[PDB]
């Protein structure tokens, strides 16, 4: 048995900022502070204006990224689980959930802009991090790329759910995991955009 009246609900994922890629300079903007984020996670009611393609999102314990592609805001299952996302009308249920792909998605919030999937086949990629660094990555397989400049794994913490882009700024993948050796990230693992496209039909 258990006491049902005291069973808690998981909070919603909350948009707390964005990585601004609109100009000549990439930079992180915060749109909600910690107290606001906590309240909004509980109510699921977020009246803030959303802008841009890459959102900074938070659960109760973690902060990471979510990326709009083709009208869906995507992130990683290992970060978001099955959580709703906060919105002006209250919590919004996931439109896609796939633990096997490590992928989730919600309808893209009004005001967001979407990336278009890459069609050029370029293996010269750019990873956008949660601190708005744009890091060159050479594609090494369907779901792997090598960092041109290896970094401590700390550099990539919080970037899960962010985009890998081709030279034309189209979406190639969603960053999911670092391949690390003695704390140094030499490569990255990602969910290829073709996998998102199959999920969408
Ligand atoms: C991302 O979720 C994030 O931004 N999280 C912060 C809290 C909000 C995070 C970004 C990492 C820089 N991703 C992860 O933590 C992923 C997820 C994927 C499912 C489990 C976790 C683990 N993870 C990783 O990136 C890990 N990497 C690995 O487990 C790789 N293995 C190794 O690096 C390794 C090293 N020595 C011996 C054996 N293995 C594997 C390699 C094969 C492909 C998948 C990843 C860590 C260790 C956290 C970087
Ligand atoms: Zn492209």
From TrEMBL:
Cystine connections: 118-120
Record: residues binding Zn(2+) 2: 118, 120, 166, 170
Binding site for Zn(2+) 3: 118, 166
Protein origin, superkingdom: Viruses
Positions with a binding annotation for Zn(2+) 1: 118, 120
Protein location: Host cell membrane; Host cytoplasm, Host perinuclear region; Host endoplasmic reticulum membrane; Host lipid droplet
Location of the Peptidase S29 domain: 22-201
Protein family (similarity comment): Belongs to the hepacivirus polyprotein family.
Summary of subunit composition and partner proteins: Homodimer. Interacts with host SPCS1; this interaction is essential for viral particle assembly. Interacts with envelope glycoprotein E1. Interacts with envelope glycoprotein E2. Interacts with viroporin p7. Interacts with serine protease/helicase NS3. Part of the replication complex composed of NS2, NS3, NS4A, NS4B, NS5A and the RNA-directed RNA polymerase embedded in an ER-derived membranous web. Part of the viral assembly initiation complex composed of NS2, E1, E2, NS3, NS4A, NS5A and the mature core protein. Forms a heterodimer with envelope glycoprotein E2. Interacts with mature core protein. Interacts with protease NS2. The heterodimer E1/E2 interacts with host CLDN1; this interaction plays a role in viral entry into host cell. Interacts with host SPSB2 (via C-terminus). Part of the viral assembly initiation complex composed of NS2, E1, E2, NS3, NS4A, NS5A and the mature core protein. Interacts with host NEURL3; this interaction prevents E1 binding to glycoprotein E2.
Function field: RNA-dependent RNA polymerase that performs primer-template recognition and RNA synthesis during viral replication. Initiates RNA transcription/replication at a flavin adenine dinucleotide (FAD), resulting in a 5'- FAD cap on viral RNAs. In this way, recognition of viral 5' RNA by host pattern recognition receptors can be bypassed, thereby evading activation of antiviral pathways. Cysteine protease required for the proteolytic auto-cleavage between the non-structural proteins NS2 and NS3. The N-terminus of NS3 is required for the function of NS2 protease (active region NS2-3). Promotes the initiation of viral particle assembly by mediating the interaction between structural and non-structural proteins.
Annotated protein name in UniProt: Genome polyprotein
Annotated organism of origin: hepatitis C virus genotype 1a
């Amino acid at each position: 048995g258990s006491h049902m009246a005291s069973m808690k609900k998981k909070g919603s994922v909350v948009i707390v900022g964005r990585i601004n890629l609109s100009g000549d300079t990439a930079y992180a903007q915060q749109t909600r502070g910690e107290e606001g984020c906590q309240e909004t996670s509980q109510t699921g009611r977020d009246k803030n204006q959303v802008e841009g393609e890459v959102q900074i999102v938070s659960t109760a314990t973690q902060t990471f990224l979510a990326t709009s592609i083709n009208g869906v805001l995507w992130t990683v299952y290992h970060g978001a689980g099955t959580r709703t996302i906060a919105s002006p009308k209250g919590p919004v249920t996931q439109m896609y959930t796939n633990v096997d792909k490590d992928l989730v998605g919600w309808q893209a919030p009004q005001g967001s802009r979407s990336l278009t999937p890459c069609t050029c086949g370029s293996s010269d990629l750019y990873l956008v991090t949660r601190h708005a660094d744009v890091i060159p990555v050479r594609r090494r397989g369907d779901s792997r790329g090598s960092l041109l400049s290896p970094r401590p794994i700390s550099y990539l913490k919080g970037s899960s759910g962010g985009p890998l882009l081709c030279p034309a700024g189209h979406a190639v993948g969603i960053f999911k995991a670092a391949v690390s050796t003695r704390g140094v990230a030499k490569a990255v693992d990602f969910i290829p955009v073709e996998s998102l496209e199959t999920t969408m039909r």
